[PDB]
Design a protein around this ligand. Structure first.
Ligand SMILES: Nc1ncnc2c1ncn2[C@@H]1O[C@H](COP(=O)(O)OP(=O)(O)OP(=O)(O)O)[C@@H](O)[C@H]1O
Ligand SMILES: Nc1ncnc2c1ncn2[C@@H]1O[C@H](COP(=O)(O)OP(=O)(O)OP(=O)(O)O)[C@@H](O)[C@H]1O
Ligand SMILES: [Mg+2]
Ligand SMILES: [Mg+2]
Ligand SMILES: [Zn+2]
Ligand SMILES: [Zn+2]
Lengths: 391, 391
């Protein structure tokens, strides 16, 4: 049995799931005013971030049964039928499906659609699923009444990684020289699954020497063992890669602050945070189409690529995604504001515009990167103040 | 079962459909004087405006059966045959087809044309269809005797949005501080489908806290949830976009009032209202062709584009449609009143003429925009009076 005390660095996701817990505890409070709940919820994120652990914590916060099946184990139609029959016999319950993209061969899919339409939501039943490849799902699953809510689960930041280390060392004897805050600063790019395996390695080092406490030297030796060798499990960002990433993020923020139509900036970080930054489209944005605001949007979208070329003469895979999105926007502009030759010149002009801004404001770019390399994240209150002294 | 009491902001469309209700209740009153009814009717409008709901309200006002099929589900010929056979067995009835542009692959289309020609209109049978892409329909469907009547369904205005909110809150308990008139003023650009989803969101906020009434704070928090995030459904016009739109509409009205041949102005609004304003040609205008009236028509058609350039130095997608229509008119002028070099200079001269009027009457332009930004619409009685004090 697990609850929300076993989860670290997922504050925003836990905030959206509070409504589901209230519904499962007493459905009648929703029915008496006509509030209608969704039938399916989708969790999307990279592997090892704790999507299976979040679903089990919902069923623990409310004492309800938990029926589950894995989509990688696929007689298939008969198994789906049995799963939904059990959930109906116990009114408030949860149905969970893992690796849904594997199963959604055509007889099994049809049975699931039939089962989704054939149960009553007012009884207190809800279905959950998880995946890390949301863009290959069948469009029939996402139609209204089947799977209409989505929640994003992100990799942790420095304060999130420290919380996960504390959760998994509360039953282990530690020496007095252990500083979990220093250990967190040395593992950017780790996820919760990597951090849980690191604690086991440090305990094996102590046990093999007969000691009864884990020291600070054990933790530092375990980091090197999990990132190299014939048996490696984890990747981390090196100091050289950290510098190139910092310049890419600061290039976006500098260009936005200079163009008149640019949007406000609220956060800069080394770890990706949104669904766009994670590479998802989610099968998905202004009422009015104007020439001046579309050109300022193109210039700011190329700010990361322009800082890489003026400082390093290189190009990364993130900058290649940016150049692809820009071409799509320019193509739609030509067909609405008044062919391939025209699209190519629009993108070229915006790229030249961004490089002049980077050159003219090179001093402010350097100052921001230095702060980022030591803090790893700048938030709204501090970011707003910092941007004032510069510029 | 639904009737005309479940529909808001569609007064003009409901006025045209009253004839259809009388015909279905007693066909003999039309036959005894030789009045001949159309065989098909077409509803055209943006998605979510309630075209499917209007058809079901016609079949409820008169107690007649309602046979329907969706064109996005396309054996096809056999299904069309069955649908029309059922309708004949019950004399006064309705046949409805949704997403007709999807189905109108060639065997299905031929069967529909055969069925349209093979039923007797005097029995009390009529066919209805709906679409939001009227300009890609096959020309064979629109010939006389098949689909010869069209009705336009528009997005709602401020008073229309207030009526839809009242329809969907008549079974819900509301607090005493709720003011549906203030909520309507804060959602320009919403349609009836967006407004129905907003009421469900405000009820979920109240239920998750255990309360038994919906307060004014719930409604204001629901607006922010539906316009942003990984799960967004609606778009609204922002205060910055509102100002640019107001100047475009007032530029047309000012130029018309000054040129001697300009047409009278009856209405100005922020929401589009006609079929021309919605971007439809409808496969469709004076008996006499004169030089002076054609030049005054060109100058007034460029008044919206001229106000954008003199006040903001920008250009929108609506102004690009205007410049395209102007070129077509000038091209036809050259071939009738006495080549590409000639057309280009005619359009350039008219554009220069309109900019001088905007500069010379800048004071009256500003006064009209201020009233529009607070009322959102000026009608004939008030508009006529207002235009008198100015000028
Ligand atoms: N935030 C977290 N706090 C604590 N443990 C975590 C967290 N995230 C992941 N873990 C650990 O990750 C291990 C496995 O990850 P889990 O299966 O829960 O995630 P997942 O995203 O569903 O992964 P996968 O795609 O591999 O199935 C669990 O044992 C749990 O200990
Ligand atoms: N004027 C209105 N009054 C009340 N409800 C409305 C109105 N217009 C739309 N709706 C709501 O819109 C919802 C769906 O829209 P509907 O299918 O009737 O319109 P449509 O134009 O045919 O849409 P679509 O293109 O999506 O099929 C209905 O549940 C109805 O509640
Ligand atoms: Mg797992
Ligand atoms: Mg519909
Ligand atoms: Zn980038
Ligand atoms: Zn115009």
């Amino acid at each position: 049995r697990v609850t929300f005390k076993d989860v670290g660095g997922a504050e925003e996701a836990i905030e959206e799931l509070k409504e589901v817990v209230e519904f499962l505890k007493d459905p009648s409070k929703f029915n008496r005013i006509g509030a209608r709940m969704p039938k399916g919820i989708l969790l999307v994120g990279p592997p090892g971030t704790g999507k299976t652990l979040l679903a089990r914590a919902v069923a623990g916060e409310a004492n309800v049964p938990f029926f589950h099946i894995s989509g990688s184990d696929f007689v298939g139609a008969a198994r789906v039928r049995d799963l939904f029959a059990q959930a109906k016999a116990h009114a408030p319950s949860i149905v969970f499906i893992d690796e849904i993209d594997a199963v959604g061969r055509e007889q099994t899919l049809n049975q699931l659609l039939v089962e989704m339409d054939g149960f009553d939501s007012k009884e207190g039943i809800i279905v959950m699923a998880a995946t890390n490849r949301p863009d290959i799902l069948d469009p029939a699953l996402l139609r209204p009444g089947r799977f209409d809510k989505k929640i994003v689960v992100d990799p942790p930041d420095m304060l999130g990684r420290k919380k996960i280390l504390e959760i998994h060392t509360r039953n282990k004897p530690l020496a007095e020289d252990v500083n979990l805050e220093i250990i967190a600063k040395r593992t950017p790019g780790f996820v919760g699954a990597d951090l849980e395996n690191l604690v086991n390695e440090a305990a094996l080092l102590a046990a093999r020497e007969g000691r009864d406490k884990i020291t600070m030297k054990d933790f530092e030796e375990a980091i090197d063992r999990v990132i190299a060798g014939p048996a490696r499990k984890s990747l981390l960002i090196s100091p050289a890669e950290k510098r190139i990433i910092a310049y890419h993020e600061a290039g976006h923020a500098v260009v936005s602050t200079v163009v008149p139509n640019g949007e406000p900036v609220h956060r800069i970080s080394i770890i990706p945070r949104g669904y766009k930054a994670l590479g998802y489209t989610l099968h998905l944005d202004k009422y009015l189409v104007s020439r001046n605001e579309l050109l300022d949007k193109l210039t700011a979208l190329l700010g990361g690529r322009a800082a890489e070329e003026v400082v390093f003469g290189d190009v990364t895979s993130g900058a290649a995604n940016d150049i692809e999105r820009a071409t799509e926007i320019a193509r739609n502009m030509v067909s609405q504001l008044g062919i391939d030759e025209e699209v190519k010149k629009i993108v070229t002009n915006s790229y030249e515009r961004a490089k002049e801004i980077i050159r003219k404001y090179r001093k402010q770019l350097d100052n921001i990167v230095e702060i980022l390399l030591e803090k790893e994240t700048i938030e709204g209150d501090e970011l707003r103040r910092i941007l004032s002294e510069e510029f």
